[PDB]
Amino acid sequence: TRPIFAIEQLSPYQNVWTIKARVSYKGEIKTWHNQRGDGKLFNVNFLDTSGEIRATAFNDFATKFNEILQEGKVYYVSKAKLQPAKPQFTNLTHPYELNLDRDTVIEECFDESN
Numbered sequence: 001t002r003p004i005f006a007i008e009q010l011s012p013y014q015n016v017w018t019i020k021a022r023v024s025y026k027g028e029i030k031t032w033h034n035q036r037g038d039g040k041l042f043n044v045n046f047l048d049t050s051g052e053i054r055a056t057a058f059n060d061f062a063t064k065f066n067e068i069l070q071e072g073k074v075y076y077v078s079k080a081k082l083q084p085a086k087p088q089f090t091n092l093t094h095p096y097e098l099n100l101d102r103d104t105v106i107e108e109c110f111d112e113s114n
Contacts, residue, residue: 001078001105007051007096010082018078021048023071029062042066046077052092054085057100065100070108080104 002017010017024047032041039059044066046053055077057065069075079102085095 004076004078007048007053008094010053010084010096012082012084015081016079017082018076019048019053020074020076021046021050021053022074023047023069024052026071027056029066032058044069051094051096053096053098055080055098055100061100061104065104065106068106068108073109075106075108077104077106 002014004018004020007019007021010019023044025045027043027045029040029042032039040062041056041058042062043054043056046055056062069077077098081099081101083097083099085097087093087095089095
């Protein structure tokens, strides 16, 4: 479990890092008819001072992931597939895409004691 890194430090090969940020805009949940599979999928956009990023998750994995994370607040996310997006492709600068499917860990800003 890598520690929290700036959005620019995200890596697709690492396939295991941590990033903290707040939510900016929520997309929705639509199905994805793959050539040999089908299910539900949803996409959400998270904003952070380090830069702008977007998180997306698959079927039930997103339902359990979006339910934990809230709206209008800050939180942390780790153990997820990192996919960098092209800048010109999206109006946003340094757009980042995230695919959730395997075992990922997310937690809204909660009070921790230790």
